[model samples]
Target: PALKLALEYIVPCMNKHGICVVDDFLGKETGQQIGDEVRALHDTGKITWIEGKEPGCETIGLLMSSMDDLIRHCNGKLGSYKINGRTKAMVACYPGNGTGYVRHVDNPNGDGRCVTCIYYLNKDWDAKVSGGILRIFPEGKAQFADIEPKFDRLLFFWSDRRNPHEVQPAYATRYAITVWYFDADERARAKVKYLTG
Candidate 1:
């Protein structure tokens, strides 16, 4: 009952806010179990969060297995048909230590990506953690909408490069799986760096 309600609410809410937050949606035990599983992958050297690229990303099999579900969920919501089109998917696991991407958008200029998705796995999340919120500015003009990291919450938004975003400062290691849907594939969009922070 709870899961159904959360999905109903979160999907549309995130569609509007461009950010979503669902608390205790996975229950404490489930959240912890997943966290342990992800942490294990990183610890085993199966996945290492490489710096200079991004932090807290562990590219391990455990993480890779979840990609199918991620892709399906996104296609159902955002509509995807071609593998080489503008749609793309990515799976990432964060270490939860206040380290996140600087203020920027997924692909800013509206050149290709149609939607950006982020699923949060932070077991302990709150406005107080002070960081980890995905701040979004619609149309590149406005104060911003902040989505704090909450367990089992997923956020999806139109991937216009003009829509700037930022992650709040987090003190604890956090985990998230981010995916982007582009209008073009990697090769065609390779030179398009619309905006960056």
Candidate 2:
């Protein structure tokens, strides 16, 4: 299975680069469902747009699935790990109008967001046409790896302060659902922040 392979290869990669990509993680049918849902949300104006800094991209955000469902799904796949608490599963769209995100870390404070998971939902996406590639910076490395956001692919990494990443501008709409997990105590803090902040 993809999760098994992730445990074998991706987990080890985290110790070094703190990131890994898993292709066909959600298979085809479910991925399509997610993509359709995200597009529908966008068309209905349910998704909120968050404009990035100049030379950066504009993106939309909305929950991909219910929090309970997400937590259950993650627990099933990652049973060996603790895998307790999760942030809302959110779909972030990078429209094909030449927009991208600046480099940043998920947890700059190094306190919350233990793991960051992103699932790509764009079908028939050609890098030549749609270019929202995921870029990751390895610790102390001048060069980094650029990963293509192919359909049904899942990318995840440790949410460490050392792992800075960004997305490239897209010429076509790029869809991805992201989720974050945290330890019990940290998750409590995150929940409070989510409610109060």
User: Which candidate ranks first by lDDT, i.e. highest?
Assistant: 2
Model 1 lDDT tens row, 1-197: 53344347644664565554445545566556656655665567552232212233333223333433444444344333232333323335555566767877676554566666555677657767447667777764556777777876656576665457777667677666555555545325555554331
Off by over 4 Å in 2: 45-82, 141-143, 188-197
| TM per prediction | 0.59, 0.72
Off by over 4 Å in 1: 1-31, 47-100, 109-111, 140-143, 184-197
| Residues forming the 10-long window of minimal summed lDDT in candidate 1 | 47-56
Model 2 clashing residue pairs (backbone) = 57-100
Overall lDDT per candidate, in order of appearance: 0.54, 0.65
Model 1 vs. true fold: TM: 0.59
- After the best TM-score superposition of candidate 2, give how far the Cα of residue 61 lies from its true spot, in angstroms: 16
In terms of lDDT, model 2 sits at 0.65
Candidate 2 least-lDDT 10 residues: 51-60
